[PDB]
């Protein structure tokens, strides 16, 4: 049966031509093949469970999310083409569509691309002050008590996760939670002899709610930040609680509450392992010292158990000063995005493609790169115009209620496969300290990133909004791009998956090289990357941390292999110390946050070896 | 651009034939026209609602199309191609109405749950984390909210919680014992949790509509009968705490009546279930209580029953127990799917010939039973595929779910047949009309009862609320029969809500016919004037119960201001601002009329 979708003739001509040029397998690999066939999709979907049971469970709620993704992707691609045609001409639009489809670029959350924005790290201030104004079918009063505050936070997170594609960050959670803890303590709502119990009960309610998905089999991606004293002071200078008291008058209370959570979390994993919220600590570090060494030592000590917190290092708080037109502030897809910073969309450049296209010619490579990045900037501009259209149509209330801020969102140019690009270029080698870039290779990466940065900087004056760069997690992109490239270039592309760190996670190389590379290149993407290392004592750990910080790494973590039994208890080894049963899975940091390897491998294998 | 959906050739041929027979406008009216064009749909939608609604609405035509196809396949497997084809034609042309059709081959309709499994096991249907059973009130409430939200995405209709207060009391008492509640703030603490729960159930996180939930005030008899032998987690006997549970239920009803002044809201829909026999309430205290509290907003529905036999020892093979789409469904009773017969269509097909009407009716209900059987088989397949964990974890029980034969437009049907009139006490059925309605209902009853031995499961009947069906079936019939179908909308009450007729006629008809559909109906009466005293209200209630009416309510017109306060008149006593809308019970639960009529005129005049 033939169902008609109504497109402009030129777009249909474009899609037909692209089909003739590239073949159905490209469209299939892009997600615009048999996936569009509702019957095939459904029939395949309803029997995934048997296969899962045979090889290794999803429920019906996943069906209703997934069925339409190909269709809303097709729509999004079309609308982006339209807007780009409007803004820059048909040539550019056609070029973009071709690049997206053939895999020269990777449009992130493409099924959402013309409908809602990517991500944001929120301040809860408007939640505390206004309640839930974005829910228009009932007027909700602002929270007066801790329980109602926790409720509102949970509800906000769930609401926001359906108005955006990516992370819901809450860097100032504990700032606002403290207020209600103290308020309820004062009014005798909380019996004093039950204070810590009351706090931990609310930690538990929130944390578990953020790991208990109602729809689909995955919770929304959330982040918590341990704000050091420097950050609390800089961010909340001048700000007051709803009782009129100064927030900066309560730095110690906030630090103490944050500390309580990090301790409670470390304890709780032995009862039940969980992913969210992803934990980052934001520390100001200058001239060989932490400016809040108490907090740094705390994070250092507490991390010894699970290494479940990511280290954010900065040398300045200028970018966040008095925060509560050129945009500054860190944007990172994994964690550590500064308060009131986000990205409305990421479009990634496939660097290995350029390697294959260039045939080892670095000058040609850089020309191609520049052009590609300019194209991406144009697409990001179109997307932004589309989001503004959606805001105007009353479809995105988070913008209307001052929670998501469009002028505080970057347009992001992503990169993936730096290593693989260099390798195809012939600019990598193995010496005594393991796998590494050749000198010429380091220079090449320098050039790639400096070029991208140059263009990103030009973008502000070109388009009116700020661009950033990120080495994206690319859980799916890293497979699909490599697949498209293999389909196009064959044996010349020998990699099954492209990398998302400057040197591959599982590379046989010296830690010092990794650290050095991140030290060189993290600043070029303004901290839009992560160094996480698979692996002494507390002071040895601290010395390592200081060392890594001195070397200029902006965001990093150490990885352990966290065993879990069938009952969910976290431990190390093959034997569970709580229940006595055997390890059956592990949690690890694979792209920057802690996940079960089994879920990761299910996902990877099912997008890498389909049908 | 053309996008191929891969159907069996016989189905493609069928659908092409039906398109040739009925026209693109019939398909348009059915939701299988331009709605399938993603681009058109998207650009239409995009010009209250937010983006989360888009992602729900976009796929509905497509998953309806799939569900129709899959049901066709199953019916063909079970009954042959002919029967399958017949059902598809009947669904597309409006002779029948498959409810929640976008979900119909994917997940079941509704259930009234016990929270016992939640109290004892936690959230076992959420399998990516292991959740300990709640030890305390805050976590119990959390778990209840989470369960409601999870369940609302595994089913199409109501999530009933008739025994909520039975289980909430345990945790109240427990936290009070262990020093978590400071005595002096006991009622504040209870009410905080009433607030968190209630508001959560009226604050949509996705769409502009909350899940449909129900609460039931269980009288002492139902509490005793349902929970005989059952224990709380401390080993104490539930029936040892009847008075504490009653007090907690009373506390909630009093709290909600008071809260509406601060902010109006719809959910949970409130029902009071009372045992009434030989002219008296067996728990008169509860009766007088509900009667008293209803005086302000009339926000509670009266469920009246003459026996607790159906619910006896329910905690602890023809299915018995009340099923109702609005409220009052008995604990651990549900329906996996409703398919409604368009009675007006039969009237129009019959030409006024009642025997022909009855032959057609019987045939069509038989077809409906076949379709229900096929849907049930599909649900079983979904359970086997691991897709519906509420069945796996014993919250939803397939052998406690009816297949439902719905009816709508009884009145309009009788009207077209020439069987209604008007005299001094208003619009009404003639004698022949009443006999006719008896015959219709009795035919459906006969077939429902045959169903059990025919298909291995139990069938029920409901006069469905038909919020959209009542419009669309009338539109399809209008399209097919023109001036012969004079009604804009079919009725969901034995005599239409806005018909000018004596109240005694309504009560009498409900008295005659509620029993024939085993309580699968509602009588709700727009109030001329408010009741002048409690005793009067109570006399009216008792009189309604004496006549055999099984589920009923009185409607007030509740004003709201722009800030959401509930009151009466034109000016807000709270903030002084002007009335901007009204809450009323239109199909049986309290909603804003603005949204209802928006929704209605939308489907009436696209
Ligand atoms: Zn264990
Ligand atoms: Zn008011």
Residue numbers in the entry:
A (entry chain B): 1 to 56, 63 to 330, 350 to 560, 565 to 640
B (entry chain A): 1 to 47, 63 to 331, 350 to 639
What did the paper state?
The native structure was solved from crystals obtained under three different conditions, one with the buffer molecule citrate bound in the active site, another with MES and a third with glycerol. S1 Fig Occupancy of the active site of tmNrdD by various buffer components. As in T4NrdD, the α-β barrel is decorated by an extra Zn-ribbon domain inserted between the last strand of the barrel and the C-terminal loop containing the glycyl radical site. The identity of the metal ion has been confirmed by anomalous diffraction at the Zn and Fe K edges. The Zn2+ ion is coordinated by the motif CxxxHx6CxxC [CxxCx14CxxC in the T4 and E. coli enzymes]. The tmNrdD structure contains a C-terminal loop harbouring the glycyl radical site (Gly621), which dips into the α-β barrel such that its tip meets that of the finger loop in the active site. Since the T4 enzyme structure was solved as an oxygen-insensitive Gly->Ala mutant, the present structure allows the native conformation of the radical Gly in an anaerobic ribonucleotide reductase to be observed in its resting state prior to activation, as also seen by Wei et al.. Gly621 itself is completely buried from solvent and presumably undergoes a significant conformational change in order for its hydrogen atom to be abstracted by the 5’-dAdo radical generated by the activase, as postulated previously for T4NrdD and PFL.
Ribonucleotide reductases (RNRs) are highly important enzymes for all life, as they are solely responsible for the first committed step in the synthesis of the deoxyribonucleoside triphosphate (dNTP) building blocks of DNA. Class III RNRs, strictly anaerobic, generate on a separate activating enzyme NrdG the same type of 5’-dAdo radical through homolytic cleavage of a C-S bond in S-adenosylmethionine, with the participation of a [4Fe-4S] cluster. Here we present the crystal structure of a second class III RNR from Thermotoga maritima (tmNrdD), which, as purified and crystallized, surprisingly does not display such a cysteine, possessing an isoleucine (Ile) in its place. Nevertheless tmNrdD binds a substrate and its allosteric effector in productive conformations as expected from previous structures of RNRs of all three classes, and it is enzymatically active.
